[PDB]
Amino acid sequence: FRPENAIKRADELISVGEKQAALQSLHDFITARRIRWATPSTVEPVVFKFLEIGVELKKGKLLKDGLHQYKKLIQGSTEGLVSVGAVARKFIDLVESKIASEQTRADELQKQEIDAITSWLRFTWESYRAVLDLLRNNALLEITYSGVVKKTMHFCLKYQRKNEFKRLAEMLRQHLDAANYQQSDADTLQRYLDQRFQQVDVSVKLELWHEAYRSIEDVFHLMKISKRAPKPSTLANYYENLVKVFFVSGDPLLHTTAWKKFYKLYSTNPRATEEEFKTYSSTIFLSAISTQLDEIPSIGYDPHLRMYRLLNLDAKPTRKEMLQSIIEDESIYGKVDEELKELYDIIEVNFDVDTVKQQLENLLVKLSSKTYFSQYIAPLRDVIMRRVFVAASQKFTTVSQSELYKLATLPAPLDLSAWDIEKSLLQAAVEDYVSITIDHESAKVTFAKDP
Amino acid sequence: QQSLISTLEELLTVAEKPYEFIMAYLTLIPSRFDASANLSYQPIDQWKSSFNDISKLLSILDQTIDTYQVNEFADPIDFIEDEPKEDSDGVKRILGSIFSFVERLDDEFMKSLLNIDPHSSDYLIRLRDEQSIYNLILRTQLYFEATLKDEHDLERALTRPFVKRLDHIYYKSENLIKIMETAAWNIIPAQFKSKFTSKDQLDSADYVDNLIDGLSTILSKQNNIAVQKRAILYNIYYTALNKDFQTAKDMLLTSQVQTNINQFDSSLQILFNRVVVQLGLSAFKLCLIEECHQILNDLLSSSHLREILGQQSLHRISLNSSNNASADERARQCLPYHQHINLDLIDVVFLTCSLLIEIPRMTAFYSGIKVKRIPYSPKSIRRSLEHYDKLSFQGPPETLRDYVLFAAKSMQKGNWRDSVKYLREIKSWALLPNMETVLNSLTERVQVESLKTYFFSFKRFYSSFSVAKLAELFDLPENKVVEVLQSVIAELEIPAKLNDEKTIFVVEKGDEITKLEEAMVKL
Amino acid sequence: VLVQDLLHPTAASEARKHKLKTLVQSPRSHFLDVKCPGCLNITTVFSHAQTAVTCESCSTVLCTPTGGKAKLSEGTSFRRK
RNA sequence: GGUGAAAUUCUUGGAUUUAUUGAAGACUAACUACUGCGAAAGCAUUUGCCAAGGACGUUUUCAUUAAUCAAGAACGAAAGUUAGGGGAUCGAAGAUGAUCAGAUACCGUCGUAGUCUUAACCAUAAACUAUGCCGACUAGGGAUCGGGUGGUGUUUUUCUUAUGACCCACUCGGCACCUUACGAGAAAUCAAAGUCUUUGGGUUCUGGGGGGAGUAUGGUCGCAAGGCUGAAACUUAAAGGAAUUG
RNA sequence: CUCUAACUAUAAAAAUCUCUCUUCUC
Ligand SMILES: [Mg+2]
Ligand SMILES: [Mg+2]
Ligand SMILES: [Mg+2]
Ligand SMILES: [Mg+2]
Ligand SMILES: [Mg+2]
Ligand SMILES: [Mg+2]
Ligand SMILES: [Mg+2]
Ligand SMILES: [Mg+2]
Ligand SMILES: [Mg+2]
Ligand SMILES: [Mg+2]
Ligand SMILES: [Mg+2]
Ligand SMILES: [Mg+2]
Ligand SMILES: [Mg+2]
Ligand SMILES: [Mg+2]
Ligand SMILES: [Mg+2]
Ligand SMILES: [Zn+2]
């Protein structure tokens, strides 16, 4: 019939008391056969009332059914598809307002506790999933997915649930499989990509480390399979998040390369300050120095080769090659503070432990004069400690323990215990650079590798 | 049905005699239940009205005790009988009614609570109504113990309320059970006939256990064996909850109820699952690591822990299978939320067991010694470690399994502080009834297993390493360290010069290459 | 058609046809051992039971009259034998 | 009004229509079909009661109790006859106004008995499917009605099972249908009108050219109308059936 | 290899008919 009479009858069913009759009536109006023949764009507000009472009610799968029938009634041209996309974005916005209402009820309930929202959250999340599954394989819907993605992303931000991301990601995977299954819109791929960027941004907006990294690896696969290069505006913070992941995740060379890429992306944005460039270069340089050496071909297959599939590279360089490449660069090398460069030249070339530690006592407090030393201490500290180990092995073999205990003792910001010293030496020996014989009858250490 | 229900209520209002009241209720209450028999759960107000006029039935019988069924001169009724015609005796063909009403209410209530959101307030008020259901159970038990006199008939008609007294009591602590009993006895100002004389004293502590054990003792005398197995499983349930673990293990060994349980229905197996996991948890409370290792090696060996234990919603079970016949079957055996034992606690207990049993032994296996480690425990922590070793992510922890695996990797590496820090970070331990002592025992055992795995790991690049310094830096008594070292040397016979007057080793002899060379030189 | 083996019809074809028209006039019915949800006893019932079969143990009528087979009582368990 | 055209007839006491009501008896529209029930006639608003029956289901019961059937019986459309009750409509008779050569016929208006009933006679109809009943077999196809079968079936909706309603593959029975002849017929046609000269399943009742004639007469039933039974004298070479061409 | 929409509106009267019917064989 008429949208206004439909709204009147839904209002009457609000009045008498039965809202499910309002839902069924609005379903009758929207899903009628004549909506196929009549222009769906003209009859918009019946769907709006359907949305209103559906929010009042608890029937989200019938919402999905009504929306899918209203698609099925208009499958030829773009006008009705834009109309249904608008009503779908309105539905997503309205259920997000309902989620805010449930949040304020939960806040009041918390105050009463001091002085089941999960049901409504599950209902609304399943409504989101039904909307997402419904809008698959349809082409001309463009702003529709953008609106749905944005409001769903707000939904994921407001509440903390890790299984919702898994469900959403796998369902998008199946949707892209279906889209491949039924292949004139080149914005769809970029739309999924931007959904992924919002996923990453919110996943790092609140206390997550693996969700964002999984979305990021999917983003890498999407870049490489597709043609277009993502937005530098969002890729800057995207690689900031990617750097946030590489703190303990494993290989630190990937952290160095990604933080280099963040420096590269920050080199052209309107917000450009040169002391920030100095600080970013110092951070990159200290992180690169913190990277642990890897000079020995391993046994069999080290399972740390699948990571380099995140930064477009496959060949395996060493830390020395990476730092030489950093030296070959210009943007970083013209902005690093000179004291860190001095300490670097102390660390690697002519790493005589006595003079290196003395220059550490000279330059470590000054290295903390600017707020950059807190970034990477532990791997750099382990590097200097392993350097003490290797230099002591090179120097002499016949020696007692306590001499090593005091020749390995480090200044305040990089110091450890004696058992820490022994355990670090033990696990550097487990790597099997040079085997050692450690006796304790007179507390002696002897480096024995027959040349 | 609804108009007939209203008509019977009208006739109850018109009726005057108590026997007419009881007959009208006997015609009406099952009509209401049949009007609410197709539904999953009944209207709360209508179900409470059925509860209330069932209690009305019981109270009016209490006003007409043993008189509506005339005395044993003629046990069947004598006066007007031509109209209903359904009067043959007054023993069990008419008396066997009210417990049926109670149990129908209880079945509908259980289906409702499984069909209600556990975290909602309506679930809590339904629990408050379950309190009244148990009080009605007690009132019905009192009335039925009053009615039947012959001990055979009394037993046959009164073991069922013993089962009911079990079914809604066993889980809570003794205090709240005493409170429930006192409240029920207050709700009945007058009636008092019981086999066990509860009203006389409610001031002792060894009373809930005594009452439940008396229920099991009285229950063991009737012919039904499945009910007897049910009662012994409930005894295990209660003992592993409150009493201790030694008694539960001893009566498990006394009852040997293992072979008749799977041939029967699934409820027996469900209760077996719950009591076995409960006793494993209690053994871990009493610091029995290898014991609960042996215990939980039955349910967690298989991948599924949802169906077998029975702790689940319906959406999470409606996707594993897609047919309607089992969607009402795969969910019918579901378990009440006021009964649940945390899956997180079970998983972290089993994972801690795997960490304490395997990692030192797997270190000894990797070192080169093969003398003892024959078996391969199903679904151990080694498979999780290998699967983690198979993937591309090696970063921060995500769940309880990740924290357990990282505690295992710190265990392997040589330290113990990261493992205990993760265990304190593992927040599945907030449900331990005993916190301080079990945490101290776990800390000491983490220390000792780290020291053992360090003994296994480094004996090749070492020729001498300290033992008392290890004890000081690992917080273990030195004598306990040397005793653990002697135990290890008995288990493996490691070639090593071990001393107490010296506290210094002499290890450089040879692990296995020398022995193979010796055997080849032999012949 | 035009050449068969009436001695050896296909068993699928054999049960396909109507009884009283097969090779040997055999009955379609069978006997089910039904247990009430209440009592664990086993009570035998003819598949197309006519009367309202009652378990002698308790008034728990298991199968109701119908044109075809008697309809069970939603709680019992039947075994083919 | 009414018709092909018109007149008779009612109408300023206002006929025709326009509304409300109320009375009577009538029938049960449209649902309504190659669909159902019954032995046939016949049966169509709703509801209750009364009894009955078919078909289906049945590892229920008896064991030839079976088929048709002279004699005997029960029903038996409409019209008709008694009597009593009702009396709308419609209409044999009659009265009319037309058409025509005549029209006391067809068209047109009024109108008696009937039409509807209540008990009793009447027992005939193109009471036709112009195919007697009970059996067995033989060819392809669909639907349809009644029952009962099996679905991992669909929507149903009461969350889900249960029903119901549908979809499929059935099967038993019923009205039927379509295609075909490889069977029949003289053909029209028939799935029986086949299984008939290669002549035999069991059984009743009818006809022997057409007229005379269902007439004469005698019975017999009926008040009456008339029904059942039922010829002959005599008169003729055709009557008749189906199809073909004009 | 996807489907089920249109439709109209006539009647007056006209009866009868004498013959003559004749082969197919090469
Ligand atoms: Mg007038
Ligand atoms: Mg009608
Ligand atoms: Mg019909
Ligand atoms: Mg006769
Ligand atoms: Mg008549
Ligand atoms: Mg005239
Ligand atoms: Mg006349
Ligand atoms: Mg006339
Ligand atoms: Mg007239
Ligand atoms: Mg006749
Ligand atoms: Mg003749
Ligand atoms: Mg004649
Ligand atoms: Mg005569
Ligand atoms: Mg002819
Ligand atoms: Mg003349
Ligand atoms: Zn029973």
Swiss-Prot record, chain A:
It is found in: Cytoplasm. Residues 277-451 form the PCI domain. Belongs to the eIF-3 subunit A family. The eukaryotic translation initiation factor 3 (eIF-3) core complex is composed of TIF32, PRT1, NIP1, TIF34 and TIF35. A subcomplex of TIF32, NIP1 and PRT1 mediates the interaction with eIF-1, TIF5/eIF-5 and HCR1. The factors eIF-1, eIF-2, eIF-3, TIF5/eIF-5 and methionyl-tRNAi form a multifactor complex (MFC) that may bind to the 40S ribosome. TIF32, NIP1 and TIF-5/eIF-5 comprise a minimal 40S-ribosome-binding unit. TIF32 interacts with 18S ribosomal RNA and RPS0A. RNA-binding component of the eukaryotic translation initiation factor 3 (eIF-3) complex, which is involved in protein synthesis of a specialized repertoire of mRNAs and, together with other initiation factors, stimulates binding of mRNA and methionyl-tRNAi to the 40S ribosome. The eIF-3 complex specifically targets and initiates translation of a subset of mRNAs involved in cell proliferation. Present with 52700 molecules/cell in log phase SD medium. This is Eukaryotic translation initiation factor 3 subunit A. The chain holds residues 6 to 495 of 964 of the full protein.
UniProtKB/Swiss-Prot annotation, chain B:
Signal peptide: none annotated. It is found in: Cytoplasm. One of its GO terms (molecular function) is mRNA binding. GO terms for cellular component: cytoplasm; cytoplasmic stress granule; eukaryotic 43S preinitiation complex; eukaryotic 48S preinitiation complex; eukaryotic translation initiation factor 3 complex; multi-eIF complex. GO terms for biological process: formation of cytoplasmic translation initiation complex; translational initiation. Its main location: cytoplasm. Keywords: Cytoplasm, Initiation factor, Phosphoprotein, Protein biosynthesis. Belongs to the eIF-3 subunit C family. Present with 78900 molecules/cell in log phase SD medium. The eukaryotic translation initiation factor 3 (eIF-3) core complex is composed of TIF32, PRT1, NIP1, TIF34 and TIF35. A subcomplex of TIF32, NIP1 and PRT1 mediates the interaction with eIF-1, TIF5/eIF-5 and HCR1. The factors eIF-1, eIF-2, eIF-3, TIF5/eIF-5 and methionyl-tRNAi form a multifactor complex (MFC) that may bind to the 40S ribosome. TIF32, NIP1 and TIF5/eIF-5 comprise a minimal 40S-ribosome-binding unit. NIP1 interacts with TIF5/eIF-5 and SUI1. This is Eukaryotic translation initiation factor 3 subunit C. It comes from Saccharomyces cerevisiae (strain ATCC 204508 / S288c) (Baker's yeast).
